[PDB]
Amino acid sequence: TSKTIDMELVKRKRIEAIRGQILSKLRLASPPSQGEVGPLPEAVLALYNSTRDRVAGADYYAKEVTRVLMVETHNEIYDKFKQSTHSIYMFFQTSELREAVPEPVLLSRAELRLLRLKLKVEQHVELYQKYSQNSWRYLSNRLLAPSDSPEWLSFDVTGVVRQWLSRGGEIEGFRLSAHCSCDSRDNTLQVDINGFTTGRRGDLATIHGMNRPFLLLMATPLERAQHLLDTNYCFSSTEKNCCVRQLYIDFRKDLGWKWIHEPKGYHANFCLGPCPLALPGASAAPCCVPQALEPLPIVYYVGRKPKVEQLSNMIVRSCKCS
Amino acid sequence: TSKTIDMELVKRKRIEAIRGQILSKLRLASPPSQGEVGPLPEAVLALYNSTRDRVAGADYYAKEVTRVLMVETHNEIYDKFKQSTHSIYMFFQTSELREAVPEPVLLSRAELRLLRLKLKVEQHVELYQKYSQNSWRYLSNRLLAPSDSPEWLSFDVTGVVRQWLSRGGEIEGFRLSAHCSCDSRDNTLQVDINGFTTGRRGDLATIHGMNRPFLLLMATPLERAQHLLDTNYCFSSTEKNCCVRQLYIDFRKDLGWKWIHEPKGYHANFCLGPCPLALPGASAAPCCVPQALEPLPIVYYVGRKPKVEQLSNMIVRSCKCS
Ligand SMILES: *[C@@H]1O[C@H](CO)[C@@H](O[C@@H]2O[C@H](CO)[C@@H](O[C@@H]3O[C@H](CO)[C@@H](O)[C@H](O)[C@@H]3O)[C@H](O)[C@H]2NC(C)=O)[C@H](O)[C@H]1NC(C)=O
Numbered sequence: 001t002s003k004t005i006d007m008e009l010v011k012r013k014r015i016e017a018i019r020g021q022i023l024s025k026l027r028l029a030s031p032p033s034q035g036e037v038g039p040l041p042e043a044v045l046a047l048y049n050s051t052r053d054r055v056a057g058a059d060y061y062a063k064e065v066t067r068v069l070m071v072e073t074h075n076e077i078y079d080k081f082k083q084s085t086h087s088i089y090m091f092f093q094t095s096e097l098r099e100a101v102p103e104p105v106l107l108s109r110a111e112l113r114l115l116r117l118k119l120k121v122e123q124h125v126e127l128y129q130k131y132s133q134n135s136w137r138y139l140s141n142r143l144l145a146p147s148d149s150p151e152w153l154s155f156d157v158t159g160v161v162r163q164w165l166s167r168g169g170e171i172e173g174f175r176l177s178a179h180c181s182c183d184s185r186d187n188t189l190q191v192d193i194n195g196f197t198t199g200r201r202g203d204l205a206t207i208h209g210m211n212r213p214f215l216l217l218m219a220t221p222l223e224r225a226q227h228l229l230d231t232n233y234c235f236s237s238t239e240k241n242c243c244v245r246q247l248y249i250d251f252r253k254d255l256g257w258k259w260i261h262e263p264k265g266y267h268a269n270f271c272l273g274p275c276p277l278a279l280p281g282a283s284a285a286p287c288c289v290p291q292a293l294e295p296l297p298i299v300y301y302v303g304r305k306p307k308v309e310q311l312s313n314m315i316v317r318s319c320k321c322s
Numbered sequence: 323t324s325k326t327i328d329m330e331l332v333k334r335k336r337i338e339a340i341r342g343q344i345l346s347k348l349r350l351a352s353p354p355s356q357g358e359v360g361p362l363p364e365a366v367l368a369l370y371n372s373t374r375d376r377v378a379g380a381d382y383y384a385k386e387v388t389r390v391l392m393v394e395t396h397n398e399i400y401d402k403f404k405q406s407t408h409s410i411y412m413f414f415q416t417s418e419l420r421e422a423v424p425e426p427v428l429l430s431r432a433e434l435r436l437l438r439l440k441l442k443v444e445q446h447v448e449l450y451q452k453y454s455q456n457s458w459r460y461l462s463n464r465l466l467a468p469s470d471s472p473e474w475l476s477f478d479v480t481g482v483v484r485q486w487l488s489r490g491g492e493i494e495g496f497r498l499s500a501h502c503s504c505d506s507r508d509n510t511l512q513v514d515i516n517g518f519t520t521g522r523r524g525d526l527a528t529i530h531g532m533n534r535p536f537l538l539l540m541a542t543p544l545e546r547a548q549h550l551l552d553t554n555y556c557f558s559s560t561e562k563n564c565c566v567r568q569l570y571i572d573f574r575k576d577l578g579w580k581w582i583h584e585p586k587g588y589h590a591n592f593c594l595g596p597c598p599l600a601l602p603g604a605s606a607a608p609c610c611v612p613q614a615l616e617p618l619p620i621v622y623y624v625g626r627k628p629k630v631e632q633l634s635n636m637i638v639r640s641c642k643c644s
């Protein structure tokens with residue numbers, strides 16, 4: 001009767017809020033048209049598919065998504081890196097990476113994606129960044145699960161691509177090689193090579209044809225680009241917006257407590273400010289709520305025995321509207 | 323005049339909220355006493371110090387903090403692992419680990435801590451978990467920064483310690499060994515050993531005397547223990563508390579939009595419910611706000627050229643009170 005509609009009304013409220021959320025995120029005053037193009041082309045479907053199932057691991061405005069495939073194997077130059085059975089090389093032309101992203105500042109997230117298909121043994125791999133000529137800098141670690149069905153893998157390589165877009169040669173790239181562990185005893189050193197158990201190399205990742213390694217990019221488009229953990233505080237913002245008000249709390253002066261031996265006081269902060277769609281969560285009631293929270297360790301005695309305990313979420317480091 | 327006091331009143335409000343926050347987090351109806359014990363003993367000061375500067379990287383109720391030093395080197399057994407110049411071994415007695423934590427379920431966070439002092443060259447290290455007898459299972463990776471002043475290091479080892487407390491032998495431990503990289507070409511294999519550049523072993527980490535490797539533990543005490551990313555939804559909670567109401571939004575039926583080619587609709591969810599101190603943020607205005615948020619990739623045409631973009635924070639996966 002009443003309550004039923006009373007909730008259908010609230011749902012209908014956010015539908016008009018999301019209608020404003022999507023348009024404001026796109027910097028669009030009006031909904032556009034369908035476009036000139038039956039079914040969509042497979043170049044954007046593969047790009048949309050690549051984005052639908054994000055693996056592993058947040059600006060408000062929308063981000064343009066583009067992918068750039070690496071230069072084909074047995075094409076251009078593989079002369080330097082021949083006969084490395086346990087290492088897969090990937091190289092990208094910076095001219096076509098700059099074609100996707102006009103300026104390094106626009107890039108917000110870049111992730112290299114590969115296609116693994118092995119199902120029997122796990123593979124421990126490593127990722128390296130090329131420096132100068134044939135000098136390699138370690139990036140990240142990754143273990144591979146024995147999945148019968150192929151699953152995509154991603155590597156967060158944003159900071160590297162931003163340096164590539166800004167300067168350096170036109171040919172930059174990565175190197176996915178096997179992880180080894182070595183423990184030495186009594187003048188004898190054992191090397192346990194892990195990952196790339198099959199010498200074919202083509203058994204671990206897909207390197208020929210379509211579905212080859214590419215570099216997925218997420219950047220702000222240039223039309224949007226115009227205008228547009230770090231602590232936030234109310235004095236530095238110079239605005240009435242939601243911020244962090246610092247409040248030192250003494251246990252002796254404020255709470256009147258004497259039982260906490262350490263610390264004598266701590267910087268408990270709180271949020272404050274009104275949240276006003278052109279002016280992020282698009283909820284039915286935006287609030288000034290904290291985002292970042294640190295714990296607070298304290299010391300006190302319980303009878304004869306002291307206790308050192310940590311209280312979670314006692315200090316506010318950053319607020320936000322939602 | 324007015325506004326000044328009007329803000330001092332709000333600050334005084336949260337002081338009584340934090341007064342309830344700290345006591346409710348400790349399950350204390352009243353503030354306790356100072357205790358039987360001038361300056362505090364150095365055993366809890368080192369334990370309080372260990373907690374004050376947490377490095378690297380959230381239950382509501384307080385967590386008991388205890389540390390357990392590893393068995394002394396050149397003491398008990400080091401016979402098996404002698405002459406491993408690039409590997410530091412650490413072993414803990416499970417009887418005294420069970421002395422700190424009575425049941426594996428109580429343990430919420432465990433972190434092994436070491437003391438590094440090198441300043442010249444960076445050290446790339448690895449961490450391993452002992453399996454059976456002299457079988458090692460990789461845990462995590464870590465690079466070490468050349469700091470002139472010593473800095474503490476931590477390793478999240480919670481899942482391992484919980485398995486140790488539940489079953490297994492009484493002597494379990496870890497192994498911190500150097501990371502090596504190996505790239506093979508033309509029947510020649512190069513091994514670049516990184517970390518532990520000095521053969522002294524005692525140059526990288528502190529292994530004798532006090533400030534030796536210990537295992538920091540954070541668990542719920544047994545007196546508190548009685549009673550007390552996974553998606554949350556309003557139908558499953560069976561309560562009026564703040565939860566997630568699912569709402570499928572069709573672009574054709576609800577928004578009337580036809581320009582988004584893919585997807586045809588998405589599961590935009592919203593938060594709802596009243597937040598009621600015995601009944602987490604302890605702010606001046608608790609709100610039902612979302613915690614987990616996923617992006618939403620969409621596809622649409624701009625004139626002749628299509629665009630595939632991702633909109634951040636469009637789907638709500640979990641709400642919370644703050
Ligand atoms: C990208 O992912 C989409 C789905 O997210 C894939 O779309 C799929 O395309 C196939 C066409 O080969 C569809 O099969 C069709 O099934 C219907 C029955 O529903 C049948 O009548 C048709 O004759 C055809 O067999 C499939 O349904 C469709 N997936 C979904 C969920 O509708 C697409 O193929 C992927 N593209 C790439 C390049 O990975």
Ligand SMILES: *[C@@H]1O[C@H](CO)[C@@H](O[C@@H]2O[C@H](CO)[C@@H](O[C@@H]3O[C@H](CO)[C@@H](O)[C@H](O)[C@@H]3O)[C@H](O)[C@H]2NC(C)=O)[C@H](O)[C@H]1NC(C)=O
Nearest residue numbers: 262263363364365366367368369370371372374375532533
């Ligand atoms: C654990 O950390 C605490 C600080 O977080 C350390 O407390 C420090 O203890 C020394 C005593 O050796 C204090 O020095 C004192 O300075 C005052 C002047 O303020 C002087 O009058 C005294 O004669 C003495 O020299 C030092 O101030 C104090 N730190 C602070 C911030 O007050 C403690 O030593 C650490 N313990 C361990 C085991 O690491």
